[PDB]
Amino acid sequence: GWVPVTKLGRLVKAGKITTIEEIFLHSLPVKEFQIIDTLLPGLQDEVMNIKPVQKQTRAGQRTRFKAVVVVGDSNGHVGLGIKTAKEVAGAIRAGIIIAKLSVIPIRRGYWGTNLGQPHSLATKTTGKCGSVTVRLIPAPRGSGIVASPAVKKLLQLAGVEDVYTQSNGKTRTLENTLKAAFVAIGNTYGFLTPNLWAEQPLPVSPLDIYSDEASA
Amino acid sequence: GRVRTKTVKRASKALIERYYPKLTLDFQTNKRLCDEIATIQSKRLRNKIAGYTTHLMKRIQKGPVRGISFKLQEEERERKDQYVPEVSALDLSRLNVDNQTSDLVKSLGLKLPLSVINVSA
Amino acid sequence: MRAKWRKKRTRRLKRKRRKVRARSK
Amino acid sequence: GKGKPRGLNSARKLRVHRRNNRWAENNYKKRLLGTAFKSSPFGGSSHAKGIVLEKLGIESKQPNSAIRKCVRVQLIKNGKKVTAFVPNDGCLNFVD
Amino acid sequence: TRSSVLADALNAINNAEKTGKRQVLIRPSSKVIIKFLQVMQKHGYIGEFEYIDDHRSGKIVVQLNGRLNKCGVISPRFNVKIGDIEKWTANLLPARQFGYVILTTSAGIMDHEEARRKHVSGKILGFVY
Amino acid sequence: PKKRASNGRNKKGRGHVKPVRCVNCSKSIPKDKAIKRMAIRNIVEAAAVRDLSEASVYPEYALPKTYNKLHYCVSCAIHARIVRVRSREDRKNRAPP
Amino acid sequence: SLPATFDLTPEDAQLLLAANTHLGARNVQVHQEPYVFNARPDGVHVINVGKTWEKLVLAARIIAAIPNPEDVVAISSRTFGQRAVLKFAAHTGATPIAGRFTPGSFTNYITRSFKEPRLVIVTDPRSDAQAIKEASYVNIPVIALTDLDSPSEFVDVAIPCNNRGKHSIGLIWYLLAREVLRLRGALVDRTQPWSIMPDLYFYRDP
Amino acid sequence: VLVQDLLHPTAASEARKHKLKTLVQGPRSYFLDVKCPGCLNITTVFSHAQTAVTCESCSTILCTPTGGKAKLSEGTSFRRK
Amino acid sequence: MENDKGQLVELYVPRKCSATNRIIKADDHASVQINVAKVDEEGRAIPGEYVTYALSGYVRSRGESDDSLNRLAQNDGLLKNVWSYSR
RNA sequence: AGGGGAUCGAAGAUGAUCAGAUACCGUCGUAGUCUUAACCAUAAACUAUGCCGACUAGGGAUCGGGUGGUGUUUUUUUAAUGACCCACUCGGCACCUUACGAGAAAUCAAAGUCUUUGGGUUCUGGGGGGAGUAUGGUCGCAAGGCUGAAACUUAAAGGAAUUG
RNA sequence: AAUCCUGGAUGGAACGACGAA
Numbered sequence A: 001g002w003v004p005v006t007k008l009g010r011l012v013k014a015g016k017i018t019t020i021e022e023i024f025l026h027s028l029p030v031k032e033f034q035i036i037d038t039l040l041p042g043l044q045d046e047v048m049n050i051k052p053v054q055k056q057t058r059a060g061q062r063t064r065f066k067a068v069v070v071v072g073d074s075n076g077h078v079g080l081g082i083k084t085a086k087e088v089a090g091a092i093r094a095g096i097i098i099a100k101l102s103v104i105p106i107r108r109g110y111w112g113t114n115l116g117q118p119h120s121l122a123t124k125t126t127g128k129c130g131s132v133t134v135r136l137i138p139a140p141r142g143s144g145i146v147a148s149p150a151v152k153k154l155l156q157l158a159g160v161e162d163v164y165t166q167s168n169g170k171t172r173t174l175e176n177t178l179k180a181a182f183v184a185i186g187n188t189y190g191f192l193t194p195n196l197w198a199e200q201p202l203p204v205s206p207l208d209i210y211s212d213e214a215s216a
Numbered sequence B: 001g002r003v004r005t006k007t008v009k010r011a012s013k014a015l016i017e018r019y020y021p022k023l024t025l026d027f028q029t030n031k032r033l034c035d036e037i038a039t040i041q042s043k044r045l046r047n048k049i050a051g052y053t054t055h056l057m058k059r060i061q062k063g064p065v066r067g068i069s070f071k072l073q074e075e076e077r078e079r080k081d082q083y084v085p086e087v088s089a090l091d092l093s094r095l096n097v098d099n100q101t102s103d104l105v106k107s108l109g110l111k112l113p114l115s116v117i118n119v120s121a
Numbered sequence C: 001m002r003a004k005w006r007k008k009r010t011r012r013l014k015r016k017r018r019k020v021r022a023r024s025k
Numbered sequence D: 001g002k003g004k005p006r007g008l009n010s011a012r013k014l015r016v017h018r019r020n021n022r023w024a025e026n027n028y029k030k031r032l033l034g035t036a037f038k039s040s041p042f043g044g045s046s047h048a049k050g051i052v053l054e055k056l057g058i059e060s061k062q063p064n065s066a067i068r069k070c071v072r073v074q075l076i077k078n079g080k081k082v083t084a085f086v087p088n089d090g091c092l093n094f095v096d
Numbered sequence E: 001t002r003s004s005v006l007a008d009a010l011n012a013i014n015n016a017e018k019t020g021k022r023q024v025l026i027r028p029s030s031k032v033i034i035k036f037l038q039v040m041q042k043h044g045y046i047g048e049f050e051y052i053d054d055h056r057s058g059k060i061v062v063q064l065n066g067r068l069n070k071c072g073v074i075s076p077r078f079n080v081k082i083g084d085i086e087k088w089t090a091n092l093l094p095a096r097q098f099g100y101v102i103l104t105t106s107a108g109i110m111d112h113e114e115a116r117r118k119h120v121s122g123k124i125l126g127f128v129y
Numbered sequence F: 001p002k003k004r005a006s007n008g009r010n011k012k013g014r015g016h017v018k019p020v021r022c023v024n025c026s027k028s029i030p031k032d033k034a035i036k037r038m039a040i041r042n043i044v045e046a047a048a049v050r051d052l053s054e055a056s057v058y059p060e061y062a063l064p065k066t067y068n069k070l071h072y073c074v075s076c077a078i079h080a081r082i083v084r085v086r087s088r089e090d091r092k093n094r095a096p097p
Numbered sequence G: 001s002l003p004a005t006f007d008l009t010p011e012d013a014q015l016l017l018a019a020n021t022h023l024g025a026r027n028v029q030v031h032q033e034p035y036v037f038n039a040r041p042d043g044v045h046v047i048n049v050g051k052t053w054e055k056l057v058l059a060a061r062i063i064a065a066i067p068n069p070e071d072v073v074a075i076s077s078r079t080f081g082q083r084a085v086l087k088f089a090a091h092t093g094a095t096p097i098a099g100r101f102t103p104g105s106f107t108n109y110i111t112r113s114f115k116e117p118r119l120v121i122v123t124d125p126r127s128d129a130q131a132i133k134e135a136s137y138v139n140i141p142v143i144a145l146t147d148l149d150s151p152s153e154f155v156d157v158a159i160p161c162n163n164r165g166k167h168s169i170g171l172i173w174y175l176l177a178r179e180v181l182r183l184r185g186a187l188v189d190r191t192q193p194w195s196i197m198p199d200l201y202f203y204r205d206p
Numbered sequence H: 001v002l003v004q005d006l007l008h009p010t011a012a013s014e015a016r017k018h019k020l021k022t023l024v025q026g027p028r029s030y031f032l033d034v035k036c037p038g039c040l041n042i043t044t045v046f047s048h049a050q051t052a053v054t055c056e057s058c059s060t061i062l063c064t065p066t067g068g069k070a071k072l073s074e075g076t077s078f079r080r081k
Numbered sequence I: 001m002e003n004d005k006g007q008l009v010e011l012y013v014p015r016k017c018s019a020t021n022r023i024i025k026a027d028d029h030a031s032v033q034i035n036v037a038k039v040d041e042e043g044r045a046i047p048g049e050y051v052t053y054a055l056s057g058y059v060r061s062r063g064e065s066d067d068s069l070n071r072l073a074q075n076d077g078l079l080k081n082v083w084s085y086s087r
Numbered sequence J: 001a002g003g004g005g006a007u008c009g010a011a012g013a014u015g016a017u018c019a020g021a022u023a024c025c026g027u028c029g030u031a032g033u034c035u036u037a038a039c040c041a042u043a044a045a046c047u048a049u050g051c052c053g054a055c056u057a058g059g060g061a062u063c064g065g066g067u068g069g070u071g072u073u074u075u076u077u078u079a080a081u082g083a084c085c086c087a088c089u090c091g092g093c094a095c096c097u098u099a100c101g102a103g104a105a106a107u108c109a110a111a112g113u114c115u116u117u118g119g120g121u122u123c124u125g126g127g128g129g130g131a132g133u134a135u136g137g138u139c140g141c142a143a144g145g146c147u148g149a150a151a152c153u154u155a156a157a158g159g160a161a162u163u164g
Numbered sequence K: 001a002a003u004c005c006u007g008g009a010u011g012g013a014a015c016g017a018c019g020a021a
């Protein structure tokens, strides 16, 4: 059993919320990964690298292993989670949890000629974390993902088919490359474009609609 | 030293939290009911608990104690909490207001008494 | 070593070389 | 203004600044002074034939301990001496 | 010193709209600023604006919406030929679907799609998106 | 790196301050990097004042005071149990006790 | 709009000007506060009590909009507002938090003080900056009782008052509860005075 | 403050601001017509005059300069124009 | 946006701040959705009849949400002389 | 090069300390320290932050000038002044708080408005050493300065923070 | 009913360790 302790978790278990789009539209904070594996059961995890990190002591070095995990269904959503732990398996478990918590959506778009089923990104995007800038440029069909392996895997798990890249900085720090790519694709919906100028009526929150079947 | 530990202190605080209208300031009777009302493995720990309950009751009999809240205490607290005067000091005793407050009231367009007192540096 | 004193050593050696070359020139 | 001039009639400044900052490199300098040709016991060729003079038992650098079985070689075209290495197990017994 | 005024104008606009301000005051009100803002207005990137006539150079007060991410200027005003246009746009626009590079031609100041339609080219000024 | 924005001192707009000498080690330290204290004291002490008043003609007198301004270098001020040493966050505390 | 029955009454003006709510802080003035009316000599400012009333009524509308009133939260770590918030919580649902806030009460779902509110109400944001900070992490609006030097960052509706005073805080809380109940329908008479006294929501040193 | 009208500001603020940093810069100085005792023959005088202005009929004196506004001689009557 | 033949794509058409018309992202957790109750003829509030107002973490952090909400409220009519355009 | 040369004092001499101490400490003490006329042309000459210009968050204090106020005090109760107070303003040395931002970080209201990369302009740098060396010029009475390599050598030197 | 008061310091000697990891 799950036994949620959250308004949102209670609503999800009661079945009122059937899509993560409402969560995203109301900017709701997720705290239970059960929500995400309920809404998006069809995602896949992937561990990029395990690197050990050490802390010096009176008596040698306690080494605990760091783990970088990327989750995604290949239609429009991904997450990234980093976790340190004494044992690799616990790192990977809790990193899968964190990755599901950090799930965000993607604005796929067209390179031009809006023919069918977006394949690229709608805009150029950059992301920075550390020295590392990572740029994502839109690309035509068939180009595939012109990028490094790890970033390619992140984008494949996002559902991007064709995209170009430009990096700069010590890209050999994979944590920072992936955080940069993650920010770069998160800013897609942060970017405003003329197909989003039109005003909407500001819908109401489920926390205000189904509040009775919430907390108690 | 003679410092007592959190086991003792927490247990004593619970015993006082829910058995105040009971045990008094004497270690012997407090011991002889604490062994009855709580199950404890060791006579030594029992006596330590009883001593601290006695000390806390000594504290309580002259003023209250932070962290403690038993039924009699909270009842007296709320009984004092609902105190109200029959004058309700906001009610008028005769009101003063500077000229700035005066023409504030004027700009708001209201009927009020004003015993204007001038305030200067 | 200290860069100041290394500099002082170069200056002395320059002086040395300058005069031992003036011996011929 | 990010330093460098940006005006539309300032190409000369940029040209010369490039030239000097190219001299700051290693490849450009090595290429234009001709160190391959004036020095560097070859003439910038890939290989060279030379005449053995002696065999050598050069000791390795730390952290390591070995004797590396080199040879002194006098090039035919330059006459320059160079120490050269004989790579394999037991191949010094062919360079008499 | 004060070299190009369009640059200061557009920097002011960008800083204002970064801060979220629905208005900004521009100085000192070049003709080219007016036609630039006319283009951005026509494509819906700012809104109204009002030219204040002091007898010196003018001021402009520009009402803003959040539709504009970046208005910039290219200094120097490079000369641009009719394939160099697509080169430029590919370099400094986010996508092929929106955004306008602005460039003075002999046929007035205007945007690059309009320039493609008139088959004319010129000197780049800036860009907007 | 930069331990302090004031860098040690109170030189903003000056260039040069024309130093002074530490009264303990005679070191030429600038007047702004120094540490100025003022030892305002009674001339005698808390103890012998009673004996002095007892043995004094001219009663009610004053017990005048000795005022001397002290400059110390950093090293001597730190040796003499003055401004000693602080944490990175409390270095910014600029007021006295 | 409003039916004009909500406009300021001279009785409420008497209450406010007796409690000296109008007397704001000194010429220290945060430029996010145009609520001022004609700064006084003595280096003191006077507050537009009409604007105070309007903001208070707006706050009460927002509080009444909540379906489940226990999702509203009142904070006051100041000594001068604990009784006020507790009486507010008595006459409304309004799960209160008086005294210490216990960092991780809006986050940290396993914590025992774990509230999941739809709104929070704060006596002084400076003294309760932890609560508004935590609200920023978790998508919560904030109502506050401000003076004219307060840090209004991460603050939605702000009620200009004299938070330095004992009577101002309790008066504002009392009026807020009054308006909220009038909007919910418990108090059917709008012009009626609501028999509860304002000195109930006050601080007492013993 | 994120919204305001910079075209229709308050006269209080515009008098509070520096003469150059208003919407349309202009002078905060002014002119006067002054009566000297005796010779009426009113004389036109600037606020920030820089000169010891004096009436043409009798050199009495009308103002003495300062770093800003001039100081009018005490026996005089000024009217703002 | 949308493809060659209507048929809307671009899941998650997002919200826009009522004070800046900047998009509110999924992780903008300082973003808030103020809901203001309506009233009808008596003084009482209607349940389920809200005036909505979204605000973004930027506006809230910079301290301007109060003023933004004031001006929005007066443009929607539920307030009076508090806010002024000409400062 | 003249003058002046009280103090302190590179050198040097001595007393000690020390395993040694031509170092620290002590006592002397020349040149210098001051000046005039003329050379030098350097420095952690540092804000280790080029100049011009625009814009972008709050807050108060302060230096100079200016404006206003039936404001306070002193004159001759009184005027004009001057010194203070309040409000405001231009310009300056700076400061405090926060980060919307920037940055590798330490930190920065500039080190921001820079992959959403272009306001204008000058200078400098391109792994560490060798080496600011050699040579050649040029300036200088000299001391030295400005200019300034290569051979050879090496996989790390280094910056900022972390826990020990 | 008498009744005057305080805050504050130094203090000698103590060289060195093959590299590898």
Ligand SMILES: [Mg+2]
Pocket: A168, A169
């Ligand atoms: Mg690279």
Ligand SMILES: [Mg+2]
Pocket: D007, D008, D009, E076
């Ligand atoms: Mg040009």
Ligand SMILES: [Mg+2]
Pocket: F015, F016
């Ligand atoms: Mg200096």
Ligand SMILES: [Mg+2]
Pocket: none
């Ligand atoms: Mg130099």
Ligand SMILES: [Mg+2]
Pocket: none
């Ligand atoms: Mg330098």
Ligand SMILES: [Mg+2]
Pocket: none
């Ligand atoms: Mg500047």
Ligand SMILES: [Mg+2]
Pocket: none
């Ligand atoms: Mg001034």
Ligand SMILES: [Mg+2]
Pocket: none
């Ligand atoms: Mg100033």
Ligand SMILES: [Mg+2]
Pocket: F013, J092, J093
């Ligand atoms: Mg200055």
Ligand SMILES: [Mg+2]
Pocket: D025, J126
């Ligand atoms: Mg290089």
Ligand SMILES: [Mg+2]
Pocket: none
């Ligand atoms: Mg090098």
Ligand SMILES: [Mg+2]
Pocket: none
């Ligand atoms: Mg090696």
Ligand SMILES: [Mg+2]
Pocket: none
């Ligand atoms: Mg270091």
Ligand SMILES: [Mg+2]
Pocket: K016
């Ligand atoms: Mg030895």
Ligand SMILES: [Mg+2]
Pocket: none
């Ligand atoms: Mg040795």
